[PDB]
Design a protein around this ligand. Sequence first.
Ligand SMILES: *[C@@H]1O[C@H](CO)[C@@H](O)[C@H](O)[C@H]1NC(C)=O
Lengths: 228, 211, 49, 49
Amino acid sequence: VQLVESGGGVVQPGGSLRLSCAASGFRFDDHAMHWVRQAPGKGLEWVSVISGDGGSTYYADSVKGRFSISRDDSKNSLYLQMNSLRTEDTALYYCAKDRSYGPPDVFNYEYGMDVWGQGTTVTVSSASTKGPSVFPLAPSSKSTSGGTAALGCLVKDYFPEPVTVSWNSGALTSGVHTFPAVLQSSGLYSLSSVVTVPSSSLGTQTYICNVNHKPSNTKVDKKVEPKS
Amino acid sequence: SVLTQPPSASGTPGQRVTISCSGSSSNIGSNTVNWYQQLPGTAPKLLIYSNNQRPSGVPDRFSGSKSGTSASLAISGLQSEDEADYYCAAWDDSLNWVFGGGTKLTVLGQPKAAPSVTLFPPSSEELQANKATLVCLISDFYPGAVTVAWKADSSPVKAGVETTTPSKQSNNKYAASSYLSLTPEQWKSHRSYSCQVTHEGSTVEKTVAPT
Amino acid sequence: YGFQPTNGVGYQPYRVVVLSFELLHAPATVCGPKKSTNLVKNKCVNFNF
Amino acid sequence: GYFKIYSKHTPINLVRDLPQGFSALEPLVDLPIGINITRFQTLLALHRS
Ligand SMILES: *[C@@H]1O[C@H](CO)[C@@H](O)[C@H](O)[C@H]1NC(C)=O
């Protein structure tokens, strides 16, 4: 009764992709299937449906002609072939199961979409890939207040979205808070992770942010110390 | 083919809250509605199909009504786990499934917290890197309607700033961040900058001066 | 049709009812269930009985 | 297309002769048939016992 997907990633505008979705726990000749995309932070948007029992497909109007969709009940899979993408297709893509097949066109009054997948991220652009630039944001009296003071690391200007910053190789879990990355007009991401620590302990112990960029192979440790 | 619905609804925990949708004639006229709940981060759930039929696993607090060309979810008594998006669906003879606009929920329970603000100037290595970025962090401000304004020595600025949307933490309050882009010569040009945040009329501002 | 309960949908029995209406010349037949508000008194009112 | 029927049941104090008097007949039925009519008959219960 599970739905998994695969096939996402980063392509430049003009490329092509092949998304796939594998199901488990039922037969495919009793259910229709849906591909539903969703831009990050926004509402849903239906993309396509295929009926059970062979083929009667439909696409949304903005995606007409560019896409194609098939199923395979020999392998229990869905394929969604995407050709000639544009920059407004950066989204999560969800593989949803429609109980009681037949396009909602003929089997009205009861369609639903009961079980859902976990989605797959796809983004497009020419910005390509780039490594992060790191600075330490020092603990300061303007950040200090009474018993505690905050220090952190600013990791900026990178395209390949999944990036991680830890504190002291994963040691400090108190006060460590990485904020959501921000997407600049330049097209590159940026973020800053900060942690508070007793003001008696400004420079005393080790506070080294471990920056790892997994699409690239960047690994750098930066120490944060009070301002000179 | 638009399925107009309100963007956000509200209510105290423990009473009936309705959620409407309005489609024309191919949407809700000759078709049926579904309702989908989207908790933050997860996959969407199914709530109501065929205008009033909850499937197995949906508790008996949700109902469903379809009257002519409008539809309505009706949550009977809010709780601490129903703070989510809710979408209505249709089919539209136009030959395309249509979706709602979504509606958040605002249990409005947690008292009013104070947005803790923290501001950082561009570090030294960044100064040597021929660039400059101001960093304004906001945290712990449970009602999430924060906004930000940036200040050079006396004037407001509106260029080179990026602002995160508020994000929920573990303690179920919010956090946000904003960045200011500057060339170091502009960094030393003005004697000081500041980040101000406004929240429920109230305002708190931080300020830093170059060295 | 061989209607076996171990069949997938696509060979399963569906029951079908088709309606059709006609308005030839006849005096009166099946209509709808007209509504009916309430009756007030002692006020100049606009009524339909 | 409506076949209207008025009727009245008065008690005579005779057995089978047409009396004299005044008695107005009240409507009974209304049938939206559409039927054409040009002739009619009567029905009687025979003598067998
Ligand atoms: C009754 O008979 C007449 C014969 O002149 C015919 O013209 C008429 O159509 C008949 N009535 C109906 C309702 O058809």
